[PDB]
Amino acid sequence: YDPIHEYVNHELRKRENEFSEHKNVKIFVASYNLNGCSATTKLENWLFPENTPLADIYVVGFQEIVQLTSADPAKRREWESCVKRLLNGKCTSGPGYVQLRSGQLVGTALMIFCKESCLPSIKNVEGTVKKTGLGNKGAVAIRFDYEDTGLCFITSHLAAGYTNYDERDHDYRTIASGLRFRRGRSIFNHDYVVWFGDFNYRISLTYEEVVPCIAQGKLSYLFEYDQLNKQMLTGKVFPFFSELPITFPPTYKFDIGTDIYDTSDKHRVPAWTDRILYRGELVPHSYQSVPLYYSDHRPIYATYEANIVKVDREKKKILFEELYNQRKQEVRDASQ
Ligand SMILES: O=P(O)(O)O[C@@H]1[C@H](O)[C@@H](O)[C@H](OP(=O)(O)O)[C@@H](O)[C@H]1O
Ligand SMILES: [Ca+2]
C-alpha cells in the first residue's frame, strides 16, 4: 500500500478524458435451437428484424446443429457460410463482415462476425468449451478485447426435462467454474458478459393451463411460474445477470412449420427455454422471438450498445508519474 499512488489514481480518474476515448459499439445477439434442421440463408426475419442499422458485431449461437435423440463440423460450416452470405448481402457498397471465430461442442456452436472496420480494434480472441456433467449438453464461449474493453460471449444447451431445474442449476455452476480460456482466464474477468441459449428452464404449470394463457396474452402470469426467473431471484444461478422483461410468447414446443404448440402425444408444456442474459454495463435495447418455423423452437435475439474505451497507455503513464512526483515533492516541502 502506497498513499501517494492511491492519491494519483484518484486525481487521474478525474482527468480520464485526457488519455481515453469512448465509443459505443452495437451488438446483435442471436440464438436458435435448430432441432437439426438444414442450413439456409432464409433467416432475414431473424437477423435483420428491425428497421435499424446493421450491428458492428453479430454473435450467433446455435443448439442442435444435429438433432438430439459426435459433433458435425461440416454442418456448422454450412450455417457459417449462410450467415456470412446473408450479412454481406446487406453490404452493397464496400467492406462487409468477416467471421472472427467459431467454436463447437457437439451440436452447440457459437460464431462471431464483425464489420471489417472493427477488426483493428479486436485483440486477444480466445475460445473454449465445457460439457455439462451431473452427453450432448454444454457451453461454447469466445471472448476478446475491443480496444481496452473486455467482452465474453457464451452460448449453452442445458439439461432437458420438465421438473429437473436442480440439474440445470448444477449445469450453470459446472460451466461457470469450468470454462477457462488461456492461462486460466474465467468468464467473469470481463467488462461485459452475455450468456445465452437453450437453458431449458420451464413454466411449472400443465399444458392445459399454459396454452390458453398464452392465447390470451397472460404472459405476466406465466412468468410467475418460470423456473429460470425463480432460480435467478434467489441468487442460485446467473448471479448479477439481468434479463430484459419478456414480452414474447414461450418459444418452445411448436409443431414444425406452424403456430401450434405441440399436438404430439407427448403433450410438452410450452416454455421460455431460449434466453439471453447479460452481466456488466451493457445498454439493452430489444429482446424478442421471431417467426421462423424450421424448428420446434422459435429463434430469439437481443440487441445492445456497448461502451468501449481506448486508453493511450503511454500518455497515461506519463501523467501518472508526473502527478506522483509532484505529490511526493509536495510532501517533501511540507516536511521542510
Ligand atoms: O426433446 P424435446 O422435444 O425437448 O422433449 C423433451 C423430452 O425429450 C424429455 O427430455 C422431457 O421429459 P421429462 O419431463 O421426463 O424430463 C422434456 O420435458 C421434453 O421437453
Ligand atoms: Ca429437440
Dihedral of the alpha carbons of 185, 186, 189, 191, in degrees to the nearest 10: 110
| Separation of alpha carbons 54 and 295, rounded Å | 25
In testing the pocket of ligand 1, which one of 35, 162, 165 has its CB within 8 Å of the most ligand atoms? 162
Residue 98: burial class (beta carbons within 10 Å; 0-12, 13-18, 19+) = middle
* 248 CB neighbour count, 10 Å cutoff: 14
> Pairing between strand 57-63 and 20-33?
parallel
Pocket test for ligand 1, best of 268, 272, 273, 274 (most atoms within 8 A of CB): 268
Kindly give the distance from the C-alpha atom of residue 162 to the centroid of ligand 1, in angstroms, as a whole number.
Answer: 6
For strand 283-289 and strand 97-105, is the pairing parallel, antiparallel, or unpaired? unpaired
Cell of 116: 471489417
Could you tell me the distance, in angstroms and rounded to a whole number, from the CA of residue 14 to the centre of ligand 1? 55
State the distance from the centre of ligand 1 to the C-alpha of 273, rounded, in angstroms. Answer: 12
Instruction: Identify the bridge partners of residue 229 per DSSP, sorted by sequence position.
Output: none
Which of the ligands is closest to the CA of residue 250? 1
Rg of the chain taking only CA atoms, in angstroms? 23
| Cα dihedral across residues 225, 231, 232, 238: positive or negative | negative
- Rounded distance, CA 131 to CA 68, Å? 15
In the structure grid, which three cell numbers stand for residue 241, read together?
Answer: 445477470
Say how many C-beta atoms besides its own lie within 10 A of residue 265's C-beta.
5
Q: Which ligand is nearest to the CA of 262?
A: 1
CA–centroid distance, 184 to ligand 2, in Å, is 33
Neighbours of 303 (CB within 10 A): 22
Residue 142 and residue 113 in contact, taking contact as beta carbons nearer than 8 Å: no
Q: Would you state the cell numbers that stand for residue 192, as one nine-digit string? A: 461485459
Q: Which residues pair with 274 in a beta bridge?
A: 198
**Cβ-based burial of 215 (10 A; exposed 0-12, middle 13-18, buried ≥19):** exposed
Contacts of 10 (CB under 8 A, 6+ apart): none
Rounded Cα gap, residues 125 and 145, in angstroms: 7
Residue found by looking up cell 489514481 in the block: 9
Output the nine-digit C-alpha cell for 9.
489514481
Q: Which are the contacts of 112, defined by CB distance < 8 A and separation ≥ 6?
A: 57, 58, 59, 60, 99, 100, 101, 102, 142, 144, 153
The protein residue whose alpha carbon is closest to atom 12 in ligand 1 is 161
Atom 2 in ligand 1: residue holding the nearest Cα: 160
Please tell me the residue having the least CA distance from ligand 1 atom 7. 161
Cβ neighbours for 242, distance < 8 A, ≥ 6 positions apart: 277, 278, 279, 284
Cell of 41: 440463408
In angstroms, what is the resolution?
A: 1.8
| CA 75 / ligand 1 centre spacing (Å) | 24
- Residue 38 burial (10 A CB sphere; 0-12, 13-18, 19+): exposed
Buried b (16+ CB within 10 A) or exposed e, 198-213: bbbbbbbbeeeebbeb
Which residues does ligand 1 sit against, CB inside 6 Å? 160-162, 268, 296
The CATH fold assigned to 1-336 is Deoxyribonuclease I; Chain A (3.60.10)
Give the atom of ligand 1 at the shortest distance from the alpha carbon of 164.
16
The Cα–Cα gap between 269 and 261 comes to 8
